[PDB]
Design a protein around this ligand. Structure first.
Ligand SMILES: *C(=O)[C@@H]([C@@H]1N=C(C(=O)O)[C@H](Sc2c[nH]c3ccccc23)[C@@H]1C)[C@H](C)O
Length: 350
């Protein structure tokens, strides 16, 4: 019997995707030599199996390449040689994904998986299928898009403390629609820490911090005045700042417009993309616990703001109740939990 050569690609092929390695296998014989070179002649890194039956590329294959594969199989029954030339995907565009939270970070029970592309994604389903989420203990979750570039993944309920979460965004070589391909793969891993939920009740004007169910802090607060109220609902804690200049035009509002502003504040914890913060407000300490005076922020004392900075982490939860405002938008950026599970689970890939 003459040896048989079988490659993972065909000699005519074009649009060969680079999301997977190229391989060659021998039957009724072993692989004596396999080389693969690109256009100019540079050989691709590859390794042969110990039993000599299978060879495969070991480095990343490039977009817009013309590769030529040469293989020889030897067996008792004789020899066989093949030569194959193929062309890989040529993207009209590349997009790079960015993942949050950071690798190795410990976050609160409200932290969603966040994958943000630097380009609009024409084929949302293709992107979702390219993203592998591992959870331990395993929990059901689903993808939901906040906009054309950023997709979120979360369970039905807040994470259980101690849960490991692994995120592999494998979009290299993947057609993301309209000739858009992934620029590279990214992978992050994070862990869920203590359950921290802080509740702001407009009926008491108190911000109560509960850690695993126990009250550890009760902060008098001043929230949004009736003119610019604080929206009710569930807020996810984002970034924290020892100090930050608060610019209204960052959130749409022109600085010298009626409800515009530019002020420098201390100990600020962001809880919405729309610009709601927990922060130090020495000017309204008399009002805190009594009357709402803010532009929507949860004003607290300088001491309590620093405490919040020190003790609350990314992914922890702030819940606002009983204000004269509406409900925080589900697609705010930190308002994901306000979307009903039935709607989130359904997703919006189409
Ligand atoms: C949140 O409300 C808002 C942020 N929080 C501030 C506040 O104190 O309400 C400022 S605006 C302000 C209103 N009265 C003041 C007196 C002295 C100094 C500043 C202010 C600022 C708008 C978010 C972050 O935009």
């Amino acid at each position: 019997l003459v040896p048989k050569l079988t490659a993972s690609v065909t000699d005519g092929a074009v649009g060969v995707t680079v999301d997977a390695p190229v391989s060659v296998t021998a039957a009724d014989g072993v692989l004596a030599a396999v080389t693969m070179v690109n256009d100019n002649g540079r050989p691709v890194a590859g390794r042969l199996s110990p039993d000599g039956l299978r060879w495969s590329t070991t480095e990343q294959l490039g977009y817009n390449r013309r590769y030529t594969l040469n293989a020889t199989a030897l067996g008792l029954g004789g020899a066989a040689t093949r030569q194959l030339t193929f062309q890989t995907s040529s993207p009209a565009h590349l997009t790079m994904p960015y993942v949050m939270p950071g690798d190795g970070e410990v976050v609160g029970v409200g932290e969603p998986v966040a994958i943000r592309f630097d380009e609009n994604i024409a084929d949302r389903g293709a992107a979702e299928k390219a993203i592998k989420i591992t959870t331990n203990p395993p929990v059901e979750g689903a993808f939901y898009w906040l906009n054309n570039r950023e997709v979120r993944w979360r369970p039905e309920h807040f994470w259980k403390p101690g849960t490991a979460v692994d995120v592999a965004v494998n979009t290299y070589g993947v057609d993301l629609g309209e000739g858009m391909f992934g620029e590279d793969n990214v992978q992050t891993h994070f862990t869920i820490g203590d359950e921290v939920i802080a509740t702001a009740d407009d009926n008491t004007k108190i911000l109560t911090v509960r850690v695993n169910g126990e009250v550890v802090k009760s902060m008098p607060t001043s929230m949004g005045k009736d003119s610019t109220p604080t929206a009710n609902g569930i807020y996810i804690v984002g970034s924290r700042y020892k100090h930050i200049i608060m610019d209204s035009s960052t959130y749409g509002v022109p600085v010298n417009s009626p409800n515009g502003y530019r002020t420098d504040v201390d100990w600020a914890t962001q809880i919405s993309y729309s610009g709601v913060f927990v922060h130090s407000a020495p000017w309204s300490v008399g009002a805190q616990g009594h009357t709402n005076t803010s532009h929507g922020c949860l004003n607290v004392s300088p001491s309590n703001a620093q405490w919040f900075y020190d003790h609350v982490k990314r992914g922890d939860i702030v819940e606002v109740v009983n204000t004269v405002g509406g409900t925080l938008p589900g697609i705010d950026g930190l308002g994901d939990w306000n979307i009903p599970w039935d709607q989130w689970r359904a997703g919006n890939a189409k």
